[PDB]
């Protein structure tokens, strides 16, 4: 077959980041335009990450975990190749494409738990030294980022071509709302497994406008994933740190709108982490092994979601007291451009 | 002369970090022991940083700014060479040594404003690209760290051999006190140049012991420098951000003692910094150029002081609202070991 050639060809191209502007504009008339873009762009992006996978050392490459996903990405690449010469003006060519994208979405779901298994085999088969950890961290952050960028495109298509929301984007996303729901659901799982649960104090700061509710252009699902992961972490720590005592501090959130950053601090009084152990929480390796630990996207993955549109997600803590966690986003849709790894 | 040989010889040795334990123990009887240690150790440390200076590219090496300090370090090295074969049991050999250390302390004072001039010439003579900034940052952080480690030794000696304080160390340092003084003095300069000034809310958390005042083993001068720099930064931002308005939020500090970290958050509601501009505040380059900006040690240098005994100093902010700044220290004197750059 052709995978390596197909790959080697498309990895000459550089992926094309989009802004929310461009994403929004694809959703006003335009189906066949989305198509001619994506049949080009998906192979580029697929190929680039496939090129980097195949540069991994053979002792990783050859693990069952990796070989399995290398297999998935190959099918997907090809599935989308089929369409490179099909004719855009055919109201049926466009339709078996969309089916084709969904079929590809389903293949790819179990990718997280699969890589973990590779991470795990690697830890027990070669070790957990710091130099290993840098390589794994390096490669997963890129891989997982790439993968998020592909999902973004695919959902954008399938969701539009099956007013208000434009696919997965909400041009009038109400940050407070997303916060309250992540909390209510976290609260739910907390009340179940613990039989106490912190309250929530939201506070807003709209610097420019004094007192408007804080709205933004974003992908609310991403922001929900992020907030959820954090609330879960805060609740666990708050609740267990105070089993012996009665009084249970709330989790406070502040949501601050400046001239370029829209930021979201979440503060717990859960007893905190010593500075030395904090980088650990972001490491795929030091955090994989075999109560409400089964829920949520992971801390490293939450952070990628923020980096994905030029944000970040940082933790800082005070041992003996508790932890702040902050999500940094771009206030301006203009500055919200995809972040993508290269070659 | 011999400088390059002397240098090449001593740069084979690795500097020897000390704990507060070892520092304290030098100060109970022991003068001539401090001497035989220091005549060895100072040359090692002097030599190592001198070796790294001389590995700088000739277009930096040759600037007047650098050549001047390369000259100072050489004299100092030699001044201390004189003593390598003098006889420890001579109650006068020990005495012209101490004089010799002070003489060396005075030579070295204007080193900060001198390097700035090299930084400045370099910025206008070759540029301020990011790759330059990494090199400067790299080299000054090490240089300035080294220099702090030498001063530490020298003061330790001169201060002991001219109960309670043991040189520059206070084995019962009361953190709250150091905080209040840094504030009162900052408040002073603020009241002078601005004619309003925030109040201060200290709060303590002693996790282990419920309610004891929080004491520690530290070098209070370092901690005062640090706190001062921060208070100045917070006050400026708080005061100017609210000129148009009436109400003036206080600066709050929390001082938290855990099982290994003793931490010190200082929170302002000064309007903050956007995430993108924050690394800038730590860069020697982006922060050198030609109201109460004349006071205090610098932000990068404050941070080194914290790293010096395995701590750190971090900033995180929320544009539209304000900034947290945290000093991370080791709670345990056992974990308080000098951090030193290598070869
Ligand atoms: C990483 C993670 C994954 N899943 C779950 Cl349910 N929790 C965590 C997790 C949560 C909190 C922490 N800790 C450390 C921690 C661990 C346990 C406790 C509770 N105390 C005790 O169990 C007792 F032993 F002291 C408190 C704090 C934090 O300080 C913290 C980290 C991230 C965050 O967003 C919020 C945080 O508070 C560490 C890991
Ligand atoms: C770096 C520095 C050096 N010297 C002096 Cl006096 N101040 C600063 C400095 C102080 C505050 C900031 N800003 C940014 C800043 C700048 C100006 C303002 C005031 N607002 C205005 O001037 C108005 F134009 F908006 C507010 C915040 C902060 O957010 C900040 C940084 C560090 C810190 O410890 C505490 C901080 O608050 C930046 C630089
Ligand atoms: C499970 C998956 C995500 C996984 C697991 C583990 C790894 C680890 O990859 C490593 C580990 C060490 C080195 C250093 C070295 O000696 N390099 C020379 C290379 N020949 C390079 C790489 Cl790529 C990556 C990806
Ligand atoms: C003022 C003092 C502190 C100062 C000022 C400026 C610098 C800058 O030093 C640089 C700048 C660029 C490079 C890249 C390069 O091209 N390297 C090849 C080197 N030949 C290396 C170095 Cl050491 C250091 C110290
Ligand atoms: Mg962090
Ligand atoms: Mg920082």
Numbering used by the authors:
A (entry chain A), B (entry chain A): 6 to 33, 36 to 169, 177 to 304, 314 to 366
What does the paper say about this structure?
Here, we report the discovery of a novel pan-isoform ATP competitive inhibitor of PDK, VER-246608. VER-246608 was discovered through a combination of NMR-based fragment screening and structure-guided medicinal chemistry to enhance compound potency and selectivity. The X-ray crystal structure of VER-246608 bound to PDK-2 (2.6 Ǻ) reveals that the resorcinol moiety forms a series of direct and water-mediated hydrogen bonds to various residues within the PDK-2 ATP binding site, including Asp282 and Thr346. The chloro-methylpyrimidine also forms additional contacts to the side chains of residues Asn247 and Arg250 with the di-fluoro pointing towards the open solvent region. VER-246608 demonstrated similar potency across all four PDK isoforms in a DELFIA-based enzyme functional assay in the sub 100 nM range. In general, there was good agreement between the functional assay and binding affinity data for VER-246608. The marked selectivity of VER-246608 for PDK-1 versus HSP-90 (a fellow member of the GHKL kinase family sharing substantial homology with PDK in the ATP binding pocket) is demonstrated both in terms of the relative FP IC50values (>1000 fold selectivity) and the lack of a detectable induction of HSP-70 (a well-established biomarker for HSP-90 inhibition) in PC-3 cells. Therefore, VER-246608 demonstrated significant or partial binding to only 8% of the kinases on the panel at a concentration that achieves complete inhibition of PDK activity in biochemical assays, suggesting a reasonable selectivity profile for this compound. In terms of cellular biomarker modulation, both VER-246608 and Nov3r suppressed the phosphorylation of the Ser293residue of E1α (phosphorylated by all four PDK isozymes) with IC50values of 266 and 55 nM, respectively, suggesting efficient target engagement for both compounds. Our studies have also revealed that Nov3r, in contrast to VER-246608, cannot achieve complete suppression of PDK enzyme activity or p(Ser293)E1α biomarker levels in cells.
PDK, a member of the GHKL ATPase/kinase superfamily, regulates the activity of the pyruvate dehydrogenase complex (PDC). The PDC represents a central control point in cellular energy metabolism in that it links glycolysis with the TCA cycle by catalysing the oxidative decarboxylation of pyruvate to acetyl-CoA in the matrix of the mitochondria. The four mammalian isoforms of PDK (PDK-1,2,3 & 4) reduce PDC activity through phosphorylation of specific serine residues in the E1α subunit (pyruvate dehydrogenase). PDK isozymes have been shown to be over-expressed in clinical cancer specimens and this augmented expression has been correlated with poor prognosis as well as drug resistance.
